[PDB]
Amino acid sequence: MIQRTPKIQVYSRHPAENGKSNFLNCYVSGFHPSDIEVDLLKNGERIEKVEHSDLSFSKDWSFYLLYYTEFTPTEKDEYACRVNHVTLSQPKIVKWDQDM
């Protein structure tokens, strides 16, 4: 068996074809086993609607998740990723830095 803790990155992107659109992204990478729970949060509450969730693997024992959706941030709001995995004894919460 092998188990690997995911790396978690949270960041925002505008598609170059429509620069007015802003997306909040969470790249959850290099994890094993594949079983996992991943949420975006706004001021601590779960965002129910996330339009994209794209899973892949490299080696048979290494998975990658891109989880992202359109959003309209303000300076007041705090956004975060919340990840549960068997390698994590407590849910891991990674805050979005608004400059990223």
Author numbering: 0 to 99
Copy text from the publication:
Mutation of D76 to N weakens a number of interactions with charged residues. In particular a salt-bridge with K41 is lost and the interaction with the R97 side chain that mediates an interaction between the C- and the N-termini of the protein disappears. The analysis of the ensembles suggests that D76 is in a key position with respect to the electrostatic interactions among surface residues. In order to confirm the role of the long-range interaction between R97 and D76, the R97Q mutant was prepared: in keeping with the above considerations, the mutant protein presents a significantly lower Tm value and intriguingly Q97 side chain is disordered in the structure. A specifically designed R97Q mutant next to the C-terminus allowed us to further test this hypothesis showing that the weakening of the interaction between positions 76 and 97 significantly decreases β2m thermal stability. Finally, to further strengthen the hypothesis about the importance of surface electrostatic interactions centered around D76 in determining the stability of β2m, the nonbonded energy was recalculated from the RAM simulation of the wt by modifying one-by-one the charge state for all the D–N mutants previously reported, as well as for R97Q. The resulting energies were then compared with the corresponding melting temperatures showing a remarkable correlation. Particularly relevant is the agreement between the prediction of the increased stability for the D98N mutant and the effect of the R97 mutation: this shows an energy increase higher than any of the D–N mutations but lower than the N76 mutant in agreement with the hypothesis that the interaction between the EF loop and the C-terminal residues have an important role for the stability of the protein. Thermodynamic stability of the native fold is lowered due to the weakening of a set of electrostatic interactions and to the diminished interaction between the C-terminal residues and the β2m hydrophobic core.
A recent case of systemic amyloidosis involves the highly unstable D76N mutation of beta-2 microglobulin (β2m). The D76N mutant is strongly amyloidogenic and, in contrast to the wt protein, aggregates efficiently and abundantly without seeding and under native conditions. Indeed, the 76 position is located in a solvent exposed loop between β-strands E and F. A detailed analysis of the interaction energies of the ensembles reveals that D76 is at the center of a network of stabilizing electrostatic interactions that are lost in the D76N mutant.
